[PDB]
Amino acid sequence: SKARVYTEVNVIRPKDYWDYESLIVQWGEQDDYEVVRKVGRGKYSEVFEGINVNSKEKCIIKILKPVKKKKIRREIKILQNLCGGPNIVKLLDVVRDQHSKTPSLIFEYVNSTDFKVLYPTLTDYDIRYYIYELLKALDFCHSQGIMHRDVKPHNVMIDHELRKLRLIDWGLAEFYHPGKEYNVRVASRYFKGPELLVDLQDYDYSLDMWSLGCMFAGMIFRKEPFFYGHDNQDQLVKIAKVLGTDELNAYLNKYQLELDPQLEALVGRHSRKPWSKFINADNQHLVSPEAIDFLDKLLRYDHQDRLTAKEAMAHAYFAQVRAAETSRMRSQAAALE
Numbered sequence: 610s611k612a613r614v615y616t617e618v619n620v621i622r623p624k625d626y627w628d629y630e631s632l633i634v635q636w637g638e639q640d641d642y643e644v645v646r647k648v649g650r651g652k653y654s655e656v657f658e659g660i661n662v663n664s665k666e667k668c669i670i671k672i673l674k675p676v677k678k679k680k681i682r683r684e685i686k687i688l689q690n691l692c693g694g695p696n697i698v699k700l701l702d703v704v705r706d707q708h709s710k711t712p713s714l715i716f717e718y719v720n721s722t723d724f725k726v727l728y729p730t731l732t733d734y735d736i737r738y739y740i741y742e743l744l745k746a747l748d749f750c751h752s753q754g755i756m757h758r759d760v761k762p763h764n765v766m767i768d769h770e771l772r773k774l775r776l777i778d779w780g781l782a783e784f785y786h787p788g789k790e791y792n793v794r795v796a797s798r799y800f801k802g803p804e805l806l807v808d809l810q811d812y813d814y815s816l817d818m819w820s821l822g823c824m825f826a827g828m829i830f831r832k833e834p835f836f837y838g839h840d841n842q843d844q845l846v847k848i849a850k851v852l853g854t855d856e857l858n859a860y861l862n863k864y865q866l867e868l869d870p871q872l873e874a875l876v877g878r879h880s881r882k883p884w885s886k887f888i889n890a891d892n893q894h895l896v897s898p899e900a901i902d903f904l905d906k907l908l909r910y911d912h913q914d915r916l917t918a919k920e921a922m923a924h925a926y927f928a929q930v931r932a933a934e935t936s937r938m939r940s941q942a943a944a945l946e
């Protein structure tokens with residue numbers, strides 16, 4: 610298997626671009642940034658709100674807990690390659706405790722609510738807008754040869770007042786090289802794609818589109834998580850109880866995969882359920898025909914058959930969002946002129 614798009618990015622660009630393990634980190638002055646208060650509760654790192662000592666502009670400080678030195682360089686290299694991209698969190702500096710070399714990542718300040726806490730309050734239209742803005746980030750990083758591999762509500766930070774969205778936490782992100790077999794121990798359980806659950810290791814950018822589909826389903830159907838598995842095996846069961854096992858078997862047969870008998874026993878056999886099954890009077894206002902067609906084209910076993918980020922942005926579901934952005938920019942230009 611090879612990606613349908615952006616296949617050759619890392620063949621066109623030089624070794625220095627994707628060879629993170631050889632990264633030369635020009636660290637900054639740790640003294641330039643002062644921590645203010647803790648925030649994050651994670652096992653990979655600790656997050657603090659901070660300030661630049663001089664400019665006094667706020668910032669986010671992410672101290673990377675003990676991890677393979679290679680995981681530190683991977684996250685920094687990816688953040689550097691994506692720096693400046695649409696809706697990518699902006700890495701401003703990297704410093705380290707100059708006696709233990711414990712790295713800290715300095716990001717732009719993110720005055721945001723978490724997607725998980727925000728979307729229950731959002732209108733149909735604002736869900737389209739923020740999904741669209743998230744697609745902009747994913748198309749950009751895919752176009753730069755990078756898979757995020759941990760798309761989920763916690764990693765989407767939104768300042769709803771300013772309508773700004775940022776895709777954060779690039780600690781699991783990886784460079785896409787065609788033909789390469791990757792570790793499947795990525796993404797969070799509820800957002801893991803079937804490829805991870807059946808051990809299809811030569812996956813690609815389309816993994817992120819499955820995860821986006823899971824988020825989207827949970828939002829428009831007001832069911833969080835949409836696929837609520839109790840472990841990685843049950844996660845595939847929960848998917849198969851919606852998408853059906855015929856399409857699963859066709860997918861396994863196409864990529865010459867076999868499930869362990871223990872897992873096949875749990876999956877059993879299940880009919881495909883129509884997306885309308887999840888519509889109720891309480892989520893009806895979020896589930897248009899266009900939403901279902903869009904969702905149906907994301908949540909497919911076959912990663913090759915899912916929409917790319919670019920194709921997703923072009924779906925009719927975002928027709929009004931696209932018209933708003935076209936109009937906004939044309940007006941901004943005239944105001945400047």
Ligand SMILES: O=P(O)(O)O[C@H]1[C@H](OP(=O)(O)O)[C@@H](OP(=O)(O)O)[C@H](OP(=O)(O)O)[C@@H](OP(=O)(O)O)[C@H]1OP(=O)(O)O
Pocket residue numbers: 677790791792
């Ligand atoms: O089988 P192990 O002895 O545990 O080695 C593995 C394995 O490396 P090999 O391919 O050399 O067997 C993983 O490689 P991939 O599955 O990614 O090809 C690698 O994956 P990551 O480095 O991406 O995590 C993983 O690393 P981790 O230590 O995080 O499990 C690493 O383990 P070691 O570095 O300890 O050998």
Ligand SMILES: [Cl-]
Pocket residue numbers: 798799800801802823836844848
């Ligand atoms: Cl999933």
Ligand SMILES: [Cl-]
Pocket residue numbers: 614751814815818916917918
């Ligand atoms: Cl894709």
Ligand code: NA
Pocket residue numbers: 717718719720
């Ligand atoms: Na900021």
Ligand code: NA
Pocket residue numbers: 719720721722723766
């Ligand atoms: Na925030």
Ligand code: NA
Pocket residue numbers: 803804809910911912913
């Ligand atoms: Na797949």
Ligand code: NA
Pocket residue numbers: 889890891892893894895
């Ligand atoms: Na309703």
